[model samples]
Target: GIDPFTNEAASAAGVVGGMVDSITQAINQLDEGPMGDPEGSFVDYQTTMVRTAKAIAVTVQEMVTKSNTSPEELGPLANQLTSDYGRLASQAKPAAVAAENEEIGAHIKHRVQELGHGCSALVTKAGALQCSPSDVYTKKELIECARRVSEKVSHVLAALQAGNR
Candidate 1:
């Protein structure tokens, strides 16, 4: 018997799956580019994204399993997982963008937008999963995710500002 409250967990799983797909697609695209060259920084970026995707996959699986069997405990786990995802995404963004080949900047930008959306979804869902309407921890987690995402965005902006100098 599946718990109705598992919806949030399922949604989180789907989001992580989508991120995995995006990461796979990005890897495929990198394979045919100078980014894949042995000495390129894009190789580092690709490796980092792969690691991040793996971590997210493991965390999502754990959350889904927990949610299905112990819905009451899902809130705290979701908060932790989402917070980690936000931090990983933030750390990866600037490197992903900076290492992108000139011709692939648009693709990197699109990926950044997608990651940003995923972070937002996690933050939103974390809030919705609280047992009581007044629980403050969910809100705190959301704020943390926002702050991390904002920091990543600023990192990218700073990199852009440096602009080939």
Candidate 2:
């Protein structure tokens, strides 16, 4: 059975995927480096996102790599991801969010992958860059990293929405 779509539920789900694209694009539009902001703002935040994602990844990896106290430092990661996703979930159409049957009914499944996959893409690329020996990063690197992740995530979202069951 084909699941028909409507403006309210479909559009909200789209926003969660598109939000990362928008952020990555906006970061790309800035100039070359960390000071690249035209209005003298937000560059710091973007830089911090790249750095924070890397730090979380590395520390978590460290716990696995070294074995934590097992405390490798991750209070902020759990808290922020939890609260932030909850904030975005509130914005999603309730019907779509609740559509968890997942086999025939896939609205909730699609939405879940939409948000979760996008975040994974962001964190993975950001973390990969920092894990490198030199830890090279710029807004350009961030844009490129997220853009690559963008394609990967959209494919996942499409697979989820294709109602393959």
Candidate 3:
């Protein structure tokens, strides 16, 4: 039993962890930042980040659990996750750049691009699985997990931008 899927799972976990860390850091920064009112923009930004992070984390966990099943089962889920991540990244980029934290903002933007590439890779991998007799869910899970991670990254970007405003 070579268990090639283990490596893919590790990679997915790493991506998800990294994104969660970034989002948490950004949220912490917001809490520490000087926002005029407590119940205004600060609260709104916090709420958004929290919600986004939770969604991403939950999705990734579910995807990982299902990764050992079959590619056909994971393909559509991966596609949906990728699309969601792309949309979230697009919305978050402007906010991230607006935060004026050039370093973090740039990092978020870069991750978004990376996630886009990952999505494309997933699509290709999924297509390849079509010809295989036994569908391994590893590739689709990895891609979907990456997208989930990207969603969290986008949350951090959005938080930074919102804090700046």
Candidate 4:
């Protein structure tokens, strides 16, 4: 009898292998950094949040690939990432509502909701990886989840940038 947990590990590795290529390509296409000052305005804050999410995504990707990384090490990291995304999502809603343009404001709010929901999904995936550090599949899932979070962050950032201009 085969343990399904371990059985999926190989597939997980394969998944990450593919993601690594795509994420790398996407990162390369990104502007050098997020626009506006970190504490400047609503758009600025949202821009900063996108960078934060990108940083977290890259960090988790690196951690999972290292041979020496342990579940014990990743556990705290996962929790911290979850909280980071949670804070960003919570703060974004209020900012969206405060926007002056009604049409743009609605768009920003909708993107923010997607970002928040993506982060929630990330929390579940990260928690799974934290519990099964040995499972490569879980680690792969975490990587995919983290990438999606960053993507959502970018969506929000783009909307804010366009609406402000």
Candidate 5:
């Protein structure tokens, strides 16, 4: 029987050093790509798009979970998702333009437009719910609308990630 505390400390330090090396490699790789300016670049779009899409997904999920809640309870998040989609749509052009080549740019453009249409569908359904929680048909429609938005977002993300390769 020996002691384990010393081994734990040694391994912890080794793990920290490994993490540091990994982070350094990541930074160096970033320097090799379009992430230097951090704006209006494919890299920027990837980060923002993924983040915003996740946020929208979260809001949509909240809407579904709170479908039975009063509009007052769910209204603010609906509006928040609207603005989030607005920002995401706004970035489509820059992201498309920043594509590594024309073919990918066109792909990004088309996917972004599809995402817009999907979000519009979501907003329309959410709007009805917000306007009057008493609506009998809106909740089911909202869920369907959210499903399409999620599908479109994943398509956009897939195109962007493919461009990264």
Candidate 6:
């Protein structure tokens, strides 16, 4: 009896899950690091992340635009996503000096691992949050669960921001 068609969180879940899955490649790229140019790579990586996170925000907004969802219900995630996008948009590339190479690489490795894992968790939790006819999750619950995911992403975003600073 699951309505699989109209659940906003379900939609959000699928979208974020795919986004996270794709981000894993970025994570691995950093893990396999010293990818030619540190400064340039970091610049490209940061830009990519900004676009990626912002894309999620835009997608989510569109997904819930005409639904019964209220601004209060969706505001937290909106704000969080904006913060992440903005912070990442302003990121500075790490210097490619000898001493900085390994250091920057280590930071990128740690930060992406953090974001990747947190996002993966959000994917699972969001799946559970999706409405199922037999035991459907409510709008109230989606809001709470999303807020939880929002809070969970805070540190991950912060770490990514700080890593390049």
Assess each prediction's global lDDT (C-alpha) against the native.
0.46, 0.34, 0.47, 0.52, 0.61, 0.42
**Which 10-residue window of candidate 4 scores lowest in summed lDDT?**
28-37
Please give the lDDT score for candidate 6: 0.42
lDDT of 6 by residue, 1-165 (tens): 875666665545432344444445544544554434444544455545545554544534432441244333233443344345333322322321212356554654455455544444433333333323123344434444444444434443444443343
Question: Predictions ranked by lDDT, top down?
Answer: 5, 4, 3, 1, 6, 2
Q: For model 5, state the Cα shift of residue 158 in Å.
A: 1.1
Clashes in model 2: which pairs? Answer: none
Q: Summarize candidate 1's per-residue lDDT along 1-165 as a digit string, tens digits.
A: 775654554764532233434433433443333222333355555555546645554554554455435545555555555555554444444544555355344444444454455454543544454443355565445445544544444433433322222
Q: Is candidate 1 or candidate 2 better by lDDT?
A: 1
Which residue pairs collide in model 1, if any? none
**How many clashes in each candidate?**
0, 0, 0, 0, 0, 0
lDDT of 3 at 2: 75
Query: Which segments of model 2 are wrong by more than 4 Å?
Result: 1-83, 86-94, 97-105, 133-145, 148-165
- Best by lDDT, which number? 5
lDDT of 2: 0.34
Task: Return the TM-score for each candidate structure.
Answer: 0.45, 0.27, 0.49, 0.56, 0.66, 0.41
Residue pairs clashing in model 5 are: none
**Worst window of 10 by summed lDDT in candidate 6:** 90-99
Instruction: Please list all clashing residue pairs in model 3, or write none if there are none.
Output: none
Q: Report the poorest 10 consecutive residues by lDDT, candidate 1.
A: 156-165
- Name the top TM-score candidate: 5
How does residue 28 of candidate 5 score in lDDT? 37
Task: List the candidate 1 regions with Cα displacement exceeding 4 Å.
Answer: 1-40, 100-103, 132-165
Candidates sorted on TM-score, descending? 5, 4, 3, 1, 6, 2
Cα lDDT, model 5, residue 104: 74
What lDDT is reached at residue 84 by model 5?
73
